[PDB]
Design a protein around this ligand. Structure first.
Ligand SMILES: O=c1ccn(Cc2ccccc2)nc1-c1ccnn1-c1ccccc1
Ligand SMILES: [Mg+2]
Ligand SMILES: [Zn+2]
Length: 312
């Protein structure tokens, strides 16, 4: 059978949480199939259907600075690392579902927040009043799955198919960071009181949600040079949104104001402290082998503190 193989450095480094997929766009599909074959099996998907699905998903990501095809594959790799470090915790359908959910989680992103869509009065804001872009991303995923020769789940039973699309829907919705705060609090309480039960489906859902947030935020868990350079792409989109807010006659939050570029280092600290560190802390409590994500995140926090202190 046709197993995908990577050069030695990638073969070894792809196993590590802090792996960067590199600047060679044309290797990213092969990298994803490699991860599916090792995470799921060579039999999970028909290679011809999977390759066709991947290339349709790629085509439906836009040429935006951050919310692009590279982000999709980067988020799928973090999930690969979590699944490979927690072999026995996840079902066959979950391993299939979650890598696909990650690849598809920002399909057709325009580089704008749900907030900006609401203030613009975008049609999608009327179709989906909450988790606006996330319901769109799930919609695009179902659209692509329904293209001729793109149904990678065709060999699942009716019930297994409904289950995997339900895993994907919940996983993609959970990437709405507005939903992350409450989800982590609940997981924090369930862990502390000892009521967390991975046989409770509503509990698994919450844990998959936190994994999605962790994979989505995984830029902050890279080596400093990757984290620092990704921050430029993230802020390029924030500043364009801020520009579009000013065009609507609305002063944007400082994070999106390119006039307030001086405030970015302190804004990063807040994000690490309010979002990233709590996310990887709770994830590490629930799934101990994901500790390297927390360790790498703490290292990047310390780098941003150094930027503030003029040490860079
Ligand atoms: O660096 C960042 C700064 C701010 N925010 C958003 C935010 C800040 C404060 C309170 C709430 C929300 N996110 C990031 C970040 C790091 C990695 N990914 N993302 C990200 C996530 C979703 C969308 C776009 C980017
Ligand atoms: Mg998103
Ligand atoms: Zn994302």
């Amino acid at each position: 059978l046709m197993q995908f193989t990577l050069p030695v450095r990638l073969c070894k480094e792809i196993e590590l949480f802090h792996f960067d997929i590199g600047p060679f766009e044309n290797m990213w599909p092969g990298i994803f199939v490699y991860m599916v074959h090792r995470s799921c099996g060579t039999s999970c998907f028909e290679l011809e259907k999977l390759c066709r699905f991947i290339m349709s998903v790629k085509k439906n990501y836009r040429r935006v600075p951050y919310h692009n095809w590279k982000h999709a594959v980067t988020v799928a790799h973090c999930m690969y690392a979590i699944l490979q470090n927690n072999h026995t915790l996840f079902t066959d359908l979950e391993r299939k579902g979650l890598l696909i959910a990650c690849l598809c989680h920002d399909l057709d992103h325009r580089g704008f927040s749900n907030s900006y869509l609401q203030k613009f009065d975008h049609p999608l804001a009327a179709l989906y009043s909450t988790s606006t872009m996330e319901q769109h991303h799930f919609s695009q995923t179902v659209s692509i799955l329904q293209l001729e020769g793109h149904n990678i789940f065709s060999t699942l039973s009716s019930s297994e198919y409904e289950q995997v699309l339900e895993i994907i829907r919940k996983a993609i919705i959970a990437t709405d960071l507005a939903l992350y705060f409450g989800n982590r609090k609940q997981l924090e309480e369930m862990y502390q009181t000892g009521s967390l039960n991975l046989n409770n489906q509503s509990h698994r859902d919450r844990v998959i949600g936190l994994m999605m947030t962790a994979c989505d935020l995984c830029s902050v868990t890279k080596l400093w040079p990757v984290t620092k350079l990704t921050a430029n792409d993230i802020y390029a989109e924030f500043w364009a949104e801020g520009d579009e807010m000013k065009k609507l006659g609305i002063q944007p939050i400082p994070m999106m104001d390119r006039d307030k570029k001086d405030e970015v280092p302190q804004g990063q600290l807040g994000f690490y402290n309010a979002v990233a560190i709590p996310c990887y802390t709770t994830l590490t409590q629930i799934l101990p082998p994901t500790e390297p994500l927390l360790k790498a995140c703490r290292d990047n926090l310390s780098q941003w503190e150094k930027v503030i202190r003029g040490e860079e």
